[PDB]
Every structure is written in C-alpha cells, then in structure tokens.
Swiss-Prot record, chain B:
It is found in: Cell membrane; Vacuole membrane. Signal peptide: none annotated. The target of rapamycin complex 2 (TORC2) is composed of at least AVO1, AVO2, BIT61, LST8, TOR2 and TSC11. TORC2 forms a homodimer. Contrary to TORC1, TORC2 does not bind to and is not sensitive to FKBP-rapamycin. AVO1 is required for TORC2 integrity by tethering AVO2 and TSC11 to the complex. The lineage of its organism: Eukaryota, Fungi, Dikarya, Ascomycota, Saccharomycotina. Autophosphorylated by TORC2. Component of TORC2, which regulates cell cycle-dependent polarization of the actin-cytoskeleton and cell wall integrity. TORC2 controls polarity of the actin cytoskeleton, which is required for orienting the secretory pathway toward discrete growth sites, via the RHO1/PKC1/MAPK cell integrity pathway. Present with 704 molecules/cell in log phase SD medium. The chain holds residues 1068 to 1174 of 1176 of the full protein. Belongs to the SIN1 family. This is Target of rapamycin complex 2 subunit AVO1. It comes from the Eukaryota. Residues 1-92 form the SIN1-type PH domain.
Amino acid sequence: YHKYKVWRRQQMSFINKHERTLAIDGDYIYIVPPENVKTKSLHISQVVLVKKSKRVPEHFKIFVRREGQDDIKRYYFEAVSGQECTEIVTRLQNLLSAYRMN
Amino acid sequence: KYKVWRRQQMSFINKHERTLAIDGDYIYIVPVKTKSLHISQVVLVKKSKRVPEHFKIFVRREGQDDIKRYYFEAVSGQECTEIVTRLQNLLSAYRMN
C-alpha cells in the first residue's frame, strides 16, 4: 500500500513589466531604470529595427546590434499610451532614416 | 524622457505536492480535488532520460479523445523508476491479459 510522495510539474509563463525611462538625445537613446539593472545607452547606428506593435497600440520593440556581440538584443516595451508609443516609434524611425541616408 | 515598461517573458515550473497511489487497476493522485484514473486511460508512462526523478503519464479519458500530458517529479530516481515500472506493468498486463 505504498503511497508515493510526488510533485505535479506545471509550466508557468508570464510577462513582467519593468518601469524605465526612455530618453532621446540627438542620436543617443538612454533606457534607464529608476532607483538595479544598468542603464542602456544606445546610438542610432546600433538600432536594426524599431516597430510599433500591430496588435497592441501601446507596444513597440527596438532591436539592437553591438560591436562584439553575436546576437541581436530584442527589447520589447510598452508605452504609457498608444499615442506616446507612436511618438516614440516615429521619432526613432526618423532618427534612423536620417542616420542611414548618410 | 518617456515612461515605458520593459516587457520580459518569464517562465518557470511550479511543483505541486501530491501522493500517487496504485490500487488494482486504478491510480489516485491527491494533494485541487482528488483525481482518479483507470489503467485503460493511460496511453504512455515514461521516465525522463535527462532527469532521473522525472516521469510523465499520458492520459485519454474516453474513446479516441485528445491525449492529455501530465509531468511529475518523484523523491528519487529509484522511486521514479519504481512508479514507472509498476504503472508499465499494469498497463501491459491490461493490454495483454
């Protein structure tokens, strides 16, 4: 009559949202947590893609290459609002167009 | 300066304690509410090749319903093997005897 002690294993998956500030300074983009992770300082030359989500108006992503790095870092964000999303993506798309013209 | 939220997908395994008991052709998994299986409902029971304490049991309620997949962790690789063996023996005697 041995009953065995066992654990059922259940995959959980969820999406955490961590507050940042995103600042655009000329061709630099600074992605800054308030006060533990480090601030990210990107140059427009590093951005390979920047896109407002088609499903969720408030979502956008910025993909980034760096010089000694194999992979693309893929940074997904949610803006405070659909309108702030479109502003941030447009401003970055225009900086990237301008930079790439050269 | 815009206020934005970095979205980060996080994934992990939640482990829920149960007891597993076998009585004749029935399997009881209890901590939720008690779950009872007949051996005819079991499609497959397999020990992990990577993690010796892990096993899984696949189940079909009725007829040709979609298979449901349950994953479990035992106290030890020995006890995982013992559970897997006992349930395989039962399923085999059911299919053949």
